[PDB]
Amino acid sequence: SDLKSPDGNFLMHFSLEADGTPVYKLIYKGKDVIKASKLGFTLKNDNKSLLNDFKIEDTKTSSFDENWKPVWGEVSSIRNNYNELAVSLSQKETDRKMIIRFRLFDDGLGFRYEFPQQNNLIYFTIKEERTQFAMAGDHTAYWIPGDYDTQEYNYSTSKLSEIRGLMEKAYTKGNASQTSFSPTGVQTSLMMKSQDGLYINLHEAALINYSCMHLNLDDKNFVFESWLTPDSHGDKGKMQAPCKTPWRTVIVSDDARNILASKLTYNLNEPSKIQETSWIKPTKYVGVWWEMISGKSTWSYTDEFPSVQLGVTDFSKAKPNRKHGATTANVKRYIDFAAKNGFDAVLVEGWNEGWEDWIGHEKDYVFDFVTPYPDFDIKGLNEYAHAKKVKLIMHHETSGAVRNYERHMDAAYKLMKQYGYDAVKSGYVGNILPLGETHYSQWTNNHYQYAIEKAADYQIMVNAHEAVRPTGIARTYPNLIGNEAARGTEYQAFGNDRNNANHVTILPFTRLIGGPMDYTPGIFEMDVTNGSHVNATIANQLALYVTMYSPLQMAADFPENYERFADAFQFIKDVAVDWDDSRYLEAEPGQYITVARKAKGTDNWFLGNVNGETARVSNIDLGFLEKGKKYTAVIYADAKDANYKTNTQAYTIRKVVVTSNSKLSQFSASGGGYAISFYPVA
Amino acid sequence: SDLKSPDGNFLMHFSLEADGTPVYKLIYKGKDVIKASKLGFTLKNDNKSLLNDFKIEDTKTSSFDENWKPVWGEVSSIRNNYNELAVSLSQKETDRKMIIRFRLFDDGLGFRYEFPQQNNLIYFTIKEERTQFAMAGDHTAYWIPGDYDTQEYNYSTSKLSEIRGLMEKAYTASQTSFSPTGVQTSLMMKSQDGLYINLHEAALINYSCMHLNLDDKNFVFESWLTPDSHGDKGKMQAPCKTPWRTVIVSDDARNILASKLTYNLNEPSKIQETSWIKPTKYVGVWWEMISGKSTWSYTDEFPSVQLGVTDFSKAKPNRKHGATTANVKRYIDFAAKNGFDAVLVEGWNEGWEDWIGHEKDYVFDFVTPYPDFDIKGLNEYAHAKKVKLIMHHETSGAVRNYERHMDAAYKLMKQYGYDAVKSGYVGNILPLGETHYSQWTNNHYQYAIEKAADYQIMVNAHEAVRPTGIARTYPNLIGNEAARGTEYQAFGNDRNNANHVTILPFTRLIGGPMDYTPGIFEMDVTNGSHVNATIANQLALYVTMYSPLQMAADFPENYERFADAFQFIKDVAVDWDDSRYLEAEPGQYITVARKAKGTDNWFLGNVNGETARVSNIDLGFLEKGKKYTAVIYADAKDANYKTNTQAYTIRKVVVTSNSKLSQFSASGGGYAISFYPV
Numbered sequence A: 001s002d003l004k005s006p007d008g009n010f011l012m013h014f015s016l017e018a019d020g021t022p023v024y025k026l027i028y029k030g031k032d033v034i035k036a037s038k039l040g041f042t043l044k045n046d047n048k049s050l051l052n053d054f055k056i057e058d059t060k061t062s063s064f065d066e067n068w069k070p071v072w073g074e075v076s077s078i079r080n081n082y083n084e085l086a087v088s089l090s091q092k093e094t095d096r097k098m099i100i101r102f103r104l105f106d107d108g109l110g111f112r113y114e115f116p117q118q119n120n121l122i123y124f125t126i127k128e129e130r131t132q133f134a135m136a137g138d139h140t141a142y143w144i145p146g147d148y149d150t151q152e153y154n155y156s157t158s159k160l161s162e163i164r165g166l167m168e169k170a171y172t173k174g175n176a177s178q179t180s181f182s183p184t185g186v187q188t189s190l191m192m193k194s195q196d197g198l199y200i201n202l203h204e205a206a207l208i209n210y211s212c213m214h215l216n217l218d219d220k221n222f223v224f225e226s227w228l229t230p231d232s233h234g235d236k237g238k239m240q241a242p243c244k245t246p247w248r249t250v251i252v253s254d255d256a257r258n259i260l261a262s263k264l265t266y267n268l269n270e271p272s273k274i275q276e277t278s279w280i281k282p283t284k285y286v287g288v289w290w291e292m293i294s295g296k297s298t299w300s301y302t303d304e305f306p307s308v309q310l311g312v313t314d315f316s317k318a319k320p321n322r323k324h325g326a327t328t329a330n331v332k333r334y335i336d337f338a339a340k341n342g343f344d345a346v347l348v349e350g351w352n353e354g355w356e357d358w359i360g361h362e363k364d365y366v367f368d369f370v371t372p373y374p375d376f377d378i379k380g381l382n383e384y385a386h387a388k389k390v391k392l393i394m395h396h397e398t399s400g401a402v403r404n405y406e407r408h409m410d411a412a413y414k415l416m417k418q419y420g421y422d423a424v425k426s427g428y429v430g431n432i433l434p435l436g437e438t439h440y441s442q443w444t445n446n447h448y449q450y451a452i453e454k455a456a457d458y459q460i461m462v463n464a465h466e467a468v469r470p471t472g473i474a475r476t477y478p479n480l481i482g483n484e485a486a487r488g489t490e491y492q493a494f495g496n497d498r499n500n501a502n503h504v505t506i507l508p509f510t511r512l513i514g515g516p517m518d519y520t521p522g523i524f525e526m527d528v529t530n531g532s533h534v535n536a537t538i539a540n541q542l543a544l545y546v547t548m549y550s551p552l553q554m555a556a557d558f559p560e561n562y563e564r565f566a567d568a569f570q571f572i573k574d575v576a577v578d579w580d581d582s583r584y585l586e587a588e589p590g591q592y593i594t595v596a597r598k599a600k601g602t603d604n605w606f607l608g609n610v611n612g613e614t615a616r617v618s619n620i621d622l623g624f625l626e627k628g629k630k631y632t633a634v635i636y637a638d639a640k641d642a643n644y645k646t647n648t649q650a651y652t653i654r655k656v657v658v659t660s661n662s663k664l665s666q667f668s669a670s671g672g673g674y675a676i677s678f679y680p681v682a
Numbered sequence B: 001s002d003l004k005s006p007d008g009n010f011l012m013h014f015s016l017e018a019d020g021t022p023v024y025k026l027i028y029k030g031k032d033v034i035k036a037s038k039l040g041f042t043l044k045n046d047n048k049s050l051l052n053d054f055k056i057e058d059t060k061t062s063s064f065d066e067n068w069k070p071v072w073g074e075v076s077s078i079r080n081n082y083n084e085l086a087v088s089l090s091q092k093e094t095d096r097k098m099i100i101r102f103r104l105f106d107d108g109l110g111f112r113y114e115f116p117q118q119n120n121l122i123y124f125t126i127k128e129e130r131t132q133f134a135m136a137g138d139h140t141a142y143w144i145p146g147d148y149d150t151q152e153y154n155y156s157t158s159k160l161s162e163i164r165g166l167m168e169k170a171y172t173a174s175q176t177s178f179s180p181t182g183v184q185t186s187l188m189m190k191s192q193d194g195l196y197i198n199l200h201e202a203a204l205i206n207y208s209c210m211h212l213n214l215d216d217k218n219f220v221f222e223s224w225l226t227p228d229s230h231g232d233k234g235k236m237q238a239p240c241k242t243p244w245r246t247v248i249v250s251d252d253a254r255n256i257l258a259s260k261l262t263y264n265l266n267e268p269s270k271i272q273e274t275s276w277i278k279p280t281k282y283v284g285v286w287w288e289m290i291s292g293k294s295t296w297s298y299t300d301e302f303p304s305v306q307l308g309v310t311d312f313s314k315a316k317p318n319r320k321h322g323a324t325t326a327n328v329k330r331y332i333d334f335a336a337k338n339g340f341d342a343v344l345v346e347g348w349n350e351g352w353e354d355w356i357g358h359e360k361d362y363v364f365d366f367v368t369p370y371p372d373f374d375i376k377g378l379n380e381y382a383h384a385k386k387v388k389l390i391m392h393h394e395t396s397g398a399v400r401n402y403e404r405h406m407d408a409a410y411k412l413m414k415q416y417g418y419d420a421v422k423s424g425y426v427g428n429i430l431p432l433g434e435t436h437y438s439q440w441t442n443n444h445y446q447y448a449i450e451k452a453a454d455y456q457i458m459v460n461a462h463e464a465v466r467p468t469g470i471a472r473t474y475p476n477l478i479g480n481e482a483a484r485g486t487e488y489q490a491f492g493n494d495r496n497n498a499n500h501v502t503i504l505p506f507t508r509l510i511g512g513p514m515d516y517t518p519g520i521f522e523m524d525v526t527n528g529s530h531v532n533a534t535i536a537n538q539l540a541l542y543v544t545m546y547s548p549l550q551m552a553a554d555f556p557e558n559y560e561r562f563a564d565a566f567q568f569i570k571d572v573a574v575d576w577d578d579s580r581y582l583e584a585e586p587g588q589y590i591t592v593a594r595k596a597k598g599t600d601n602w603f604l605g606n607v608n609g610e611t612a613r614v615s616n617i618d619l620g621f622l623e624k625g626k627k628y629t630a631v632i633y634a635d636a637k638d639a640n641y642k643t644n645t646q647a648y649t650i651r652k653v654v655v656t657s658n659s660k661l662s663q664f665s666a667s668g669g670g671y672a673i674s675f676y677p678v
C-alpha cells in the first residue's frame, strides 16, 4: 500500500475507494503534493470501463540503483535509483487485470498502467484516460494552451484559478495547424510553484504507441485530469494487451534547481537500443535558414507558376525569382564561415524542388526529398564541405504530408548516405494529411517514432520540428538529438509578440523536461529584414549555449553579423556542446537561470545566465571550479544600459583570473544575461 | 457544338442553358439515349461553384484513328477511332476556366473535365461532382447497391422505378451504402425499345470512385463520388482532369461486351518492356480455407498475436493450417502434372490468427513464414517443376502498414522467384473513417501497381476499387476481384444467383478482368454451402469470364475424379488473338469463341442463367475450308444448378466453318468446346 523515495522524503499511498476506484496520494517532506487522485480509463463501447470495482489481487515491491552513461548529455553518468511498488488489480464481474506500477525517486514519482495478456481484455479503445493530479491549492503555473497540433505558444504565468480567464488571450491564432480543447486545458510539461514554495512538474515519460497527454483543469477543486489527443476518428488509443501506458511524472523539490537537474524522465525510458553510438555526434552548426525566416530570402526557386507539380514543372526552364537562399554560391559562403570558425555543419533549407507550395495548401505530393533545385549543386557542395571538414545537415520538411514522407523516406535516407549527410532536420508544418488527423495522436506519434527507428538503421540523427514534445525517448534512441516542439527563436522573426523576454527562463522547466530543444540561439542583429524585433540582448544570446541545453546548437545569424561583433562571437566559437558535469547555480521559473557546465573530455567550464523582465544583479558562486586551480575567465555581459527592447547590442567583455573561492557579481538586463568561459591557467 | 461518331450513328449536342449551365445530349440512330444532362461541380467553401454562369470561350474539333497492341487481351490489335470536341468554358465573375472534352466513338461517348493552369483556381476541393445521365425512360437495369467499401453483392435485375423498393433486399467486414437509389458502375441497362446502355468511367486516377444516384421520378442518374476520411470528394490542384465518364450503347448486346472504349480512353502503356508480364493459369491452397476445411492461421493457442513477440516456433500447431510444405507440394505436383503455370498459397505468413475483425494496424509483415511453410524449399521445388508460386499479401485494411513493408515484401518476392502477388483489403481501411474507394485509398492501389511495375511484378488486388481500363497504361495489373466472386458460393446465404456470370461481363468486366476463380467440380463444400452451378458452367467460365489470370479453384482430388471434364481446363488458353461474341443477353446467357494467341485453335464457352435454353450458333468464325476436331463438354439433359450439378456429357465431332450447332444448356449451366485443326 505505501511507497517511499530512497531518501525517505517522499511518501506515496495507494488505496481503493469503497466502490473499488483506484486512488493515489503523494507527500513530500510531510506536505501534500498530490491529494487523493483517481486512476483508470473510460473505454469506448464499454458500459463498465476501468474506473472502479477493482480489488487488489497482489502487490510487489523492489529497489533499483544503477548508473548508466548517456551518449550525449549534461553529465557523464546518470543515477537511476528508485523504490518500486507494482499493484495487480482485478475487476469484479469482468475479471480483467490492470497493473499500476509506481517508481518513487528522490526527485519524485513516476507511474504507469500495464495490461498483461489475459482472457477478457484483448483489443480495446481508450475513449478518455482518467488519471488525476489533485493539487493542494491555487498554485502558480507556467503554462501553454492545450492543443492537438502545436506547442508554439508563449507561456503564461498565473494562478490555476486564473487560467480560464486568460485562455482566450493565451490561445493566439493563425498557426498553420492548431486545435484547442477546453477553456482550462494546458499542455505538459507543466510547471508549478505552490504558495509555500514547492516546485511541482507534471509530465510523462516514454510516450510510445500511445496518444500525447494534455491536462484539463477542474478550477473549482484544482484537479488536473489526463486529456489525451484524439486521432482522426476521435479515439484516444487503439490498444492491444499485452500493452502499457507511458509513465506519468510528478517531479518535485523545494529547490527549483533540482527540477532542472532531474534525470527522472530519462530514467523511466528503456536503455539504449543503439549498440554502437560513436556515429552520433553533438553538433554546432550555422545555416541557410534565418535568411528565409527573417524575410530576406525565399525557400522557393521561382515565382513563375500559380503552383508546382513535381515531375511536371520543369524548374531548369523556370524564371529564377532571384531571392532563393539555397544557391551554390550562398551555401559555399556558409561552409567557408563554418570551416573558418570550427563549426561542424551547415543546415540548408530550400535545397529541393517543391518549396513554391510548402505552406498552407494541404498538399500531399509536396516534396520528393531527393530532387535539388537547378541552382543547388548537391554533389559539388557536399564535396566542397567534406574537403573543409564540414557536413551539410539534410532538411526534410514534410508540410504535414506524412504518407508522402513515408513513401519517399528510404530513397531520401539513402540520398543522405550517398552524399555524406548524417543528420536530418525534419518538419511537420501544416495540418496532418489527410485532414482530421492531429500532430500528437497515437497514430501520428507512431510516424515520428518510425522515422527515428528507420533513421537509426541508416545511422542518421534526427531533429524533428513540429513533432510531439519529447518524453525521454532519446535514452532509448540517442540518434534523436533534437526536436523544436515549442516556441523557438524563429518566432522572434514573426512579428506579433515574438517571444516574451522571460521565455528562455520557462522553457527549461517545461519543454526541456524530456529532451533537448533546437532553439536556434545566437542572434546578434535583433531588427531583422521583415521588421520583427528579436526580444533579447546579445549577451542573452551567448548565454543560451549553456542555459538552453542541447547536443545540437545553432548559431542562427548571418555570417556578416557575426563578423560585425567578432569579439562577442568568440564565446559561440569556444563553447562546447556536450558535458561531463552541469551545476545549476540559480533558477526561478519565469525569472532567471544560471548554470555552469564542464566541457566533456576537458577541465574547461562554461557558464550562462538568462534573465527575465526584471533587471537583476546576480551573485555567482564559483565553487564548482576545481579547488587549487586558477582559471582565466572571460565574461561576456550586458552593458549597464542594455535592454531587450531598445538597446540589444550593448555588451562588455572582460578577462579576470579566478579560483573556486572567487565571488562574482553581475548585472543582467531585462531579457539579458551573461556568458563566461573558464580555462585553467597553463 | 455538335459531334458525331465516325460512323454517324451517334450525335452529341453540347449547349448552355440560359443561366450558363453546361448540358449535353446523346442520340443513337435518331433515338435519344442521354436526354439533356447537366455538367459541372459543387466545390466546398465556394459560394459560386462550377454549375453555371459559363460562356463558351472556344471550341476545338479533331479526329484520331490508330491501332495499338495489348500485352494481353481478347484481341491481338485494338482500334482507337473517335471524333473529339473540346469545349473551353469561362465563368462570369470568377473568370475560371473549365474544358469539357468529348470523344465519340462508334461504341459511344466518353467525356471528362479538365482545368488548365489558371490564376483564380489552383487548390480546390470537390464537394460533389454534378454530372448527369438523363435516361429516355424506365429502362431495365442490372445493378448493385452504391457502396464506399464493397462491391461483393448479387446483381438485381429491375426497372429503374423499382430500384428504390428493392434496395433493402439487395443490401443484404466493410460496407457503407449512401442512398435508397444509389448504384455502382459499371451499370448495365436495356431500354424498352431494345437499346443496351452502359454507364461507367475510365482512367480513375487521382480522383474519387464514381457511383450513381438515381432520381427515380425523372430517371436521371448523377455522379455520386466516394467521400474520403474527412468527407471530401476530391482534393484537386489545377492543372488537373477528371476520369472519363462513359456511355457505351448498341442495339446489339454483343457489341457492349466487344467494346474497347474503356481501354481506348486510358493512356498508352507506360511499361516499355512487357515480356515479363505472363498470362497465368493457376491452382492454389485457397478453397480449403474459404470452404471451411482448413485455416489461414497456424495456431489457436493465443487470444491475440503480436508479431515479433509471439514465438510461433513454440506455439501449438492447430493442424488445421492449409499452407503446410506437404500440402503446398501436392498442389505444385498437380500443377506441373497438368501444365498449370503457378500455385497461389494463402496463410503462408505470420499474423493470420488476428486477420479479421480487430481493426489491427501491425497485422502482417508480408515477409515472415510460419514455421510449417518452407519458403526456400517450396520455391525451389516449384521452379524445378517449371511452376511458380503466387505471393499473397492480405493487408486487412492496414494500408500504412502495407506501404511501410511494401519494398521489403516486393524484394522477398523477387528473391524467391515470385513474379505475381494477390493483395487483399478485407476489413475497414485504417484509420477508421477511411473508405475503400476514396481518392486517398485509390492512390494507394495505384501506388502498389506502379511500384510493382518498377520491380516487374504483376498485381491481382482483391477488395480494391473496380477497374476502369488502367491496365492499358499498367498491364502488370492482371486482375482484381472487386465484385462478388466464386468465394461467395462457399459462404451460404444466397451464394451467387445462377445468372450472376451472365451479368458480370456487362458490368464488372468493363474496365478490366476479374479473378473470378472458376472451375468448381464439387458444389457441396465442407462447410455445407452449395455452389450454384453445373460442371459445364464451370468449364465455360474459362472463356466467358475473360481474364489473363485464370484459377482452377477446386481441390486436386476433385479434378482427378472428373478427369475427362478437367481436360477442358487443361486445354483452354488464357490469351487471345481474336474473340467473337456469338450470343449475349444480360442476365440470361453469353456465348463466345476465342482464338488462342499464336495458334489456329479456338475455344468457346456458353453460360446460361435461370432458364434452361437451347443455344443455336454458327461456327463461321472458324477459318474457311478447314476441318477441326471439336470436343463439346455440355450439361446432361437433367443437369441442374440446384440438385444435379455434376451431370455432364463429352462428345467429339468434326466441324467446318459451315457447321451449325444446337446445344441445350441447363439452368445455371453452360457448355465448353475446344477446336483443333485436323
Ligand SMILES: OC[C@H]1O[C@H](O)[C@H](O)[C@@H](O)[C@@H]1O
Binding pocket: A289, A293, A349, A397, A427, A429, A465, A466, A484, A490
Ligand atoms: O521548414 C521550414 C520551417 O518550418 C518551421 O517553422 C521550422 O520550425 C523552421 O525552423 C523551418 O525553417
Ligand SMILES: OC[C@H]1O[C@H](O)[C@H](O)[C@@H](O)[C@@H]1O
Binding pocket: B286, B290, B346, B394, B424, B426, B462, B463, B481, B487
Ligand atoms: O485473403 C483472405 C480472403 O480475402 C477475400 O475475401 C478474398 O477475395 C479471398 O480470395 C481471400 O482468400
Ligand SMILES: [Ca+2]
Binding pocket: A152, A465, A466, A484, A490
Ligand atoms: Ca516551427
Ligand SMILES: [Ca+2]
Binding pocket: B152, B462, B463, B481, B487
Ligand atoms: Ca473478397
